[PDB]
Amino acid sequence: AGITGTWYNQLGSTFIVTAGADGALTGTYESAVGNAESRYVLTGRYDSAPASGTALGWTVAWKNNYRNAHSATTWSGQYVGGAEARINTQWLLTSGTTEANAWKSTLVGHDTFTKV
Amino acid sequence: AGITGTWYNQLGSTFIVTAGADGALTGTYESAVGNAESRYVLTGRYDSAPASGTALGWTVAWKNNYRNAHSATTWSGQYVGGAEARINTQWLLTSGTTEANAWKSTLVGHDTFTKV
Amino acid sequence: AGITGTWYNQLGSTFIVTAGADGALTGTYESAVGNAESRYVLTGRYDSAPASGTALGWTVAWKNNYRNAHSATTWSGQYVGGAEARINTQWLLTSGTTEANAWKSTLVGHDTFTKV
Amino acid sequence: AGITGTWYNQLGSTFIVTAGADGALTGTYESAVGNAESRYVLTGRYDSAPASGTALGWTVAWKNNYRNAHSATTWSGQYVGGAEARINTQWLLTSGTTEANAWKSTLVGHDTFTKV
Numbered sequence A, B, C, D: 001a002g003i004t005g006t007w008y009n010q011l012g013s014t015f016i017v018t019a020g021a022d023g024a025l026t027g028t029y030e031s032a033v034g035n036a037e038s039r040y041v042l043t044g045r046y047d048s049a050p051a052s053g054t055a056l057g058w059t060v061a062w063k064n065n066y067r068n069a070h071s072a073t074t075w076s077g078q079y080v081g082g083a084e085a086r087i088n089t090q091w092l093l094t095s096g097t098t099e100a101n102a103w104k105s106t107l108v109g110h111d112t113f114t115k116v
């Protein structure tokens, strides 16, 4: 119940996720930023038996039927329930690059998701 | 099956992955370190229509039938094919923590996966 | 003028800094968290001719005359001036470890400093 | 003078460092990549009374007499002495950006410094 729902981050991107009983995360991500259009598939895992926040992570490869940014983002963080449910994350966005440019292929950031 | 196969990181953990034609990564991760025992389910996404490196990412929630570390790792990187194929990643390991310890809930590192 | 002053982060830690004309940052950091007591020396660099925020970074080795945590934090971010002056950062906290534990030696986080 | 010396990262950038008895790191960084030309001033801190690795960090603001990248890199890691001495780091490169591009202002990577 907790994780499953629609969330939004500070950028206004939309994350629709279903937490399966087997610890699977599935849904779609609708981004507000970058070189994206439409929704993108997400897949992740979460601690289906947490103790403390619930650790989770998910990945989006920024490719759908419309665009390809040749990049993928991974969000690693934790779900914290209560009145105000939130997912606090740190993310890595890696772009496919030639060997010469790989040193600067990864962006790091942080996103806070609020459940709607 | 560039990405599909068995890879090993510097630690000697085993990453068995199947890359779907659609951009899905699925498989098992057998760690050689941390508070784990057994194999863990992984899920990810990758650029199924790359340009030079192939962007990808995956998550492992550190819970199996045997144990629960109440944490999850996300790996973000790129697969580089050729004679000596590699997956160069950066990872984020977030532990489920109280709100008091949330500031130090996430570890960052890098992993190089090879087929040897 | 901008950078020089007293700042505080979300944890209530105190950062007292002087920006030199040569791009030098010097001051002391008074932490609210970890295994710290008293002030610690900080040293950093900043873009003394910015265009956009002003890029900067500083390091604190968590050792003073009272305690030693055998760890150092680096904050990398940017100063943004105006009504509400702020320093938005991402940080790395590395602990000295044996070779066996080096894989999990680095914490990553984010701090927002408000000028007082 | 374990740390004091000249080191090179995988890219071939040169790090000339002097470690003060007090925990200060001072020196010059000559990059072999990015938007730079010449040497850059670096400042950092390190654990002057280590336990097994020696925690340290430093910053370089990418501004010299010749150019200004309006960015700064912070390296956080540990020095490991012995026959084949190394400085294993993770770094954060933040560019001064508008508020609109701040979410993607920071790159993350890893550098291994050796004396060869």
Ligand SMILES: CC(C)(C)c1cc(/N=N/c2ccccc2C(=O)O)ccc1O
Residues within 6 Å of the ligand: A009, A011, A013, A031, A032, A033, A034, A035, A036, A037, A062, A067, A069, A071, A073, A091, A093, A109, A111
């Ligand atoms: C516009 C589109 C979504 C496809 C796009 C997104 C992108 N990184 N996005 C993000 C990255 C990290 C955290 C959040 C987002 C976020 O979107 O909430 C990079 C290129 C790109 O084209």
Ligand SMILES: CC(C)(C)c1cc(/N=N/c2ccccc2C(=O)O)ccc1O
Residues within 6 Å of the ligand: B009, B011, B013, B030, B031, B032, B033, B034, B035, B036, B037, B062, B069, B071, B073, B091, B093, B109, B111
């Ligand atoms: C032992 C067990 C697997 C459960 C476990 C693993 C763990 N992160 N491991 C890793 C993290 C980053 C990169 C590689 C691995 C790797 O293992 O290859 C953290 C806590 C923990 O308990």
Ligand SMILES: CC(C)(C)c1cc(/N=N/c2ccccc2C(=O)O)ccc1O
Residues within 6 Å of the ligand: C009, C011, C013, C031, C032, C033, C034, C035, C036, C037, C062, C067, C069, C071, C073, C091, C093, C109, C111
């Ligand atoms: C208590 C003392 C400060 C010495 C201490 C601090 C510490 N990391 N601190 C931080 C780390 C990253 C960002 C901010 C802080 C911050 O303090 O604002 C780790 C061990 C420790 O003992």
Ligand SMILES: CC(C)(C)c1cc(/N=N/c2ccccc2C(=O)O)ccc1O
Residues within 6 Å of the ligand: D009, D011, D013, D030, D031, D032, D033, D034, D035, D036, D037, D062, D069, D071, D073, D091, D093, D109, D111
């Ligand atoms: C070329 C010039 C030096 C100015 C420059 C450098 C730069 N980051 N470099 C690095 C970053 C991380 C680790 C090593 C280096 C290294 O150079 O060894 C980013 C933009 C830029 O313009």
